[PDB]
Design a protein around this ligand. Sequence first.
Ligand code: ZN
Ligand code: ZN
Ligand code: ZN
Ligand code: ZN
Ligand code: ZN
Ligand code: ZN
Ligand code: ZN
Ligand code: ZN
Ligand code: ZN
Ligand code: ZN
Ligand code: ZN
Ligand code: ZN
Ligand code: ZN
Ligand code: ZN
Ligand code: ZN
Ligand code: ZN
Ligand code: ZN
Ligand code: ZN
Ligand code: ZN
Ligand code: ZN
Ligand code: ZN
Ligand code: ZN
Ligand code: ZN
Ligand code: ZN
Ligand code: ZN
Ligand code: ZN
Ligand code: ZN
Ligand code: ZN
Ligand code: ZN
Ligand code: ZN
Ligand code: ZN
Lengths: 402, 401, 410
Amino acid sequence: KIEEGKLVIWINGDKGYNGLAEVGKKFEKDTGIKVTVEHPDKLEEKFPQVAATGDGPDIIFWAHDRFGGYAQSGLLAEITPDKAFQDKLYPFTWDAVRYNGKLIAYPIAVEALSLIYNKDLLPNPPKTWEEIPALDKELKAKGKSALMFNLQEPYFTWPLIAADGGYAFKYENGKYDIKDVGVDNAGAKAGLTFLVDLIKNKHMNADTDYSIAEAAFNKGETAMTINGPWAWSNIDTSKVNYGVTVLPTFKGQPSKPFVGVLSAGINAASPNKELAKEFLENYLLTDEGLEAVNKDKPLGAVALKSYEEELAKDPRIAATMENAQKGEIMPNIPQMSAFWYAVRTAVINAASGRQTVDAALAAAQTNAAAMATLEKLMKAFESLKSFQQQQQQQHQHQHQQQ
Amino acid sequence: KIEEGKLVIWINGDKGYNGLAEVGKKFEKDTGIKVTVEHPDKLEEKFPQVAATGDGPDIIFWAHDRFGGYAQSGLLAEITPDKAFQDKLYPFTWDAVRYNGKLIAYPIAVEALSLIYNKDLLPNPPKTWEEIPALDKELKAKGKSALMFNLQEPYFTWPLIAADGGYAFKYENGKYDIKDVGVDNAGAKAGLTFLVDLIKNKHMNADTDYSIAEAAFNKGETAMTINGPWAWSNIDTSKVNYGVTVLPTFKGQPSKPFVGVLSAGINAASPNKELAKEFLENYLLTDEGLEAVNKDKPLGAVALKSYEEELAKDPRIAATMENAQKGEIMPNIPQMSAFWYAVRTAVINAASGRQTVDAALAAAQTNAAAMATLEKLMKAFESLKSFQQQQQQQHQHQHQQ
Amino acid sequence: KIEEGKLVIWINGDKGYNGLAEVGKKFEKDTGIKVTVEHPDKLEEKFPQVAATGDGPDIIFWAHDRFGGYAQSGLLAEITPDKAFQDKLYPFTWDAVRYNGKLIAYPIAVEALSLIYNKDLLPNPPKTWEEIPALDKELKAKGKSALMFNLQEPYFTWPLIAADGGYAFKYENGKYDIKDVGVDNAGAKAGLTFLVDLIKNKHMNADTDYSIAEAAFNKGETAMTINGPWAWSNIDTSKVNYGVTVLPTFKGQPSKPFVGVLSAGINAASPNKELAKEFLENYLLTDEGLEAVNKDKPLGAVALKSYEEELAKDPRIAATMENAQKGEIMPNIPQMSAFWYAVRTAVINAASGRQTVDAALAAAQTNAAAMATLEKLMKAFESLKSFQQQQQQQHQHQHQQQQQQQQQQQ
Ligand SMILES: [Zn+2]
Ligand SMILES: [Zn+2]
Ligand SMILES: [Zn+2]
Ligand SMILES: [Zn+2]
Ligand SMILES: [Zn+2]
Ligand SMILES: [Zn+2]
Ligand SMILES: [Zn+2]
Ligand SMILES: [Zn+2]
Ligand SMILES: [Zn+2]
Ligand SMILES: [Zn+2]
Ligand SMILES: [Zn+2]
Ligand SMILES: [Zn+2]
Ligand SMILES: [Zn+2]
Ligand SMILES: [Zn+2]
Ligand SMILES: [Zn+2]
Ligand SMILES: [Zn+2]
Ligand SMILES: [Zn+2]
Ligand SMILES: [Zn+2]
Ligand SMILES: [Zn+2]
Ligand SMILES: [Zn+2]
Ligand SMILES: [Zn+2]
Ligand SMILES: [Zn+2]
Ligand SMILES: [Zn+2]
Ligand SMILES: [Zn+2]
Ligand SMILES: [Zn+2]
Ligand SMILES: [Zn+2]
Ligand SMILES: [Zn+2]
Ligand SMILES: [Zn+2]
Ligand SMILES: [Zn+2]
Ligand SMILES: [Zn+2]
Ligand SMILES: [Zn+2]
């Protein structure tokens, strides 16, 4: 039961839902069909539960990486935009909303890491990673540092690692090959070796986490930091004069940060598929549609070419998109769990000097496969719980038989 | 040993063993070689144990789906019938007795699901699934229901599911591809959606089992049911005027029921491999041979073209074969274990409404891998135990080092 | 830290380390670079532990089968010999030091099983397996047996099993295909059948192990035994007049023993990679180089063609190489643990009569998969433990960097 004759939308609380409701208000005045916008707690946890039974919203807004799991479960419907509508959004975004060859969601916003520099300390940010060590010595004389960013999470260190030919899984033929991992290749080796060399030459500290990195830049202690659009608001409050720009190149190659895409998916159980399509394609994914949402709570860089060109007058939003286009799209597959587990360990152990770069990255392959087994066990036993509960109910009972 | 100079045959207690003994008695009169026919308890469980050590029968008669496990273990011999003898049996039946490319048994009988209708209530049975919802309303005016069949086991519901393009595993070039599963495709999806649509529209009950469906047809409460030849004798006692016909077509395409094939395999440890070929090919697999078995206990439809055409004068035996030819053969691979587990839950959850058809069939892949892991865990520890004794017991201990 | 400017070598205690040190001394006299040769206890277990952290020796010497694991962990560097140097060694040996398509070590010495016969009892050794049952009946009349070897280990029985077309894994394009297992094909079946046929015809005993086999040949109770070079010293002491020859052919096909290659690998963490290449290629892998090592403790057959020709004037060393050249190199992959586990059981069960050849060899496929399961099972929990305790490592390090990060500046 989702109610035929109306649309119900689920979007997270930190987004411009009131602005989205104004698009749904515009939709009513034209079609006479009422659009409700709901923003429930942990909707990402709730959606798989309710949609499995045939309930939940008509449309759901979330990051694309979580949509891979929804489509695996058959909770999302295959969308049908034509060639001409597909030309409206940046071609690279459409690859993020693909599962099993077929398209499963509409890309809305684009999210990726950028290089954030202090304008007062550093008017000309470096274009290369290689010139940062020399730039640190020049700033250490003034009692400052060149660069401080989170080293604990692989998400932040990956841009450098992937610069030279490092990848999570090979994306070819619209499918991720899980037998083709680019974690201990030549380019990932050099990327991490540069990061470790930065640490043992005291240009960075191996223990630097998110808090330590943010607090440093916002006090004016460090000239540069690596962070996403979610951090801009806190830098605005610190009164620091900052700029957001393209990430530094390593061995002439651009940094490849992970790209997160906010996407709109249609519930497979929805009896209003065509209505949702009309809403999303012809009301929301238009200049006026995205503007209403952006004015409530900024979307950052958007998928729609026409509206992105208008936001890109903000040099920070242009930088987000530029880094995104040069970046790697976040894979939406289940194997991504084992990847994080292994690479998080790999970088920690190389940065501490516990393992060589060569041996820490080699260990990732065997460490991720090990984690896949725990997940493989996890699913097997929860299946048995269900099986026993299944029979326990019908077949032999305190008041039944077979 | 299995004794050279004679044949010993294993065949289940519910088959025409006396009739087979007669065929052995004909064999003894022509060749001077004594044939013994035995029927031990749980011979399907006993065969893998004794054949592994080199003992057991020369020939074993059983459903082909169990012969995969025997051939995998190397307990069966590669049979050598020539082209001329292979034209004597229906072409599709040979696919049932093929493991790893090699042929490993002789096809004897053919079992499959068929549509059984009540002639007095419904003289003209529906040819399409699509017209059953309309046919139910017409019968509900007389307090009766159109169709009731077992919905708990997938074996019964699969015919519909596979109708439009669903399949267990892909079968090309004589071998299954365990990576080409067709339980999540558009055809299997539409098939199961029709089954669920029937239940949500009150034409069928989601909790109808084998007992409930059989009893309803034999009392005359329902007009149609889906079942195999095994159930005919119970309908015969109920005095119900019944017929057996082709399964209804869904989306203009036939239902594809799974096909069981009673097969005769030769033991790998048998010193009488040549005598078994002579007996199975030139004595049993003839009109006269199968006649003798069929008169003791009916074989149903048979693999041999000549004797089948003779049996097809019984319209029930013609329909069993017709449904079998349109259907697919029950895969004899070990991945079938996990396949059943996943599809049984898929259908139950779709029928009860715990999962949408799409979501129910999607979870099938993840449940098949679950049963695989679970099933592979138990092969791991079984092995560890065996080793443990072997090293533990044979290799050294008090009285040794 | 491994020290740049000098070479440190790890070689097992039962090898000619003094002879190697003399090659190190020769290197020092020409180049002025000192070479230390260390022989630590259980170095094969220690090397992965220390080379992971960036320590350990510059060069390591060990059987090639263990090097695959070192390469998998990225502890070994890619060696760079040119075409002209690769012609110096036997082409087959280079396949033993290969992993992921890269070369990872220099082949030094070759080790393989051979047929060892008693000369006084049997001057003309049988060229075929098929004539051994007939030759046993002749010797039983004189109160002796024809052949006695270890039947408990698959390493010893495999030569016969592999002969007609049995293989652990298919080696093509320089890669090991783990999906193509030839343990229950027609050839391996026929081999094991002959072995089992020998036992139930009382020509061999199913309970015969390494100790029973060796002691029986050394006292002069059996005419032939199958064993490696490692056992020659014991037979020398027993005053038995013995020869080492090519293994008997089964169905006209040669017996295929597994080949062990003693190899020199360069540490990936070594700051002397170019120095180690100079040493190994131009000082050790020369007639004079291997001469010095061989005179300390014999190497057996060697990888270097030139020095092999000189050693082949020993009829025992020539036979070791002959058997090694007809046999297959032991796969350097992890899947080999499960293979030994399964084949060991297969043969034990077939020999005892517990299972038929067919049933035994078919059950090897499931027994190998079961062992593979156990291994990744114990690897997954080692992974969980390591991570689980890593959560603490962070907690403690949150109270360390917090201060120091302020001490220096603050
Ligand atoms: Zn709020
Ligand atoms: Zn809320
Ligand atoms: Zn939330
Ligand atoms: Zn520096
Ligand atoms: Zn404009
Ligand atoms: Zn008997
Ligand atoms: Zn079956
Ligand atoms: Zn013929
Ligand atoms: Zn053949
Ligand atoms: Zn209806
Ligand atoms: Zn169609
Ligand atoms: Zn075909
Ligand atoms: Zn075909
Ligand atoms: Zn296919
Ligand atoms: Zn006839
Ligand atoms: Zn006759
Ligand atoms: Zn007749
Ligand atoms: Zn067909
Ligand atoms: Zn160190
Ligand atoms: Zn000199
Ligand atoms: Zn010199
Ligand atoms: Zn020592
Ligand atoms: Zn070895
Ligand atoms: Zn080659
Ligand atoms: Zn004999
Ligand atoms: Zn012993
Ligand atoms: Zn020299
Ligand atoms: Zn010389
Ligand atoms: Zn060869
Ligand atoms: Zn804490
Ligand atoms: Zn610390």
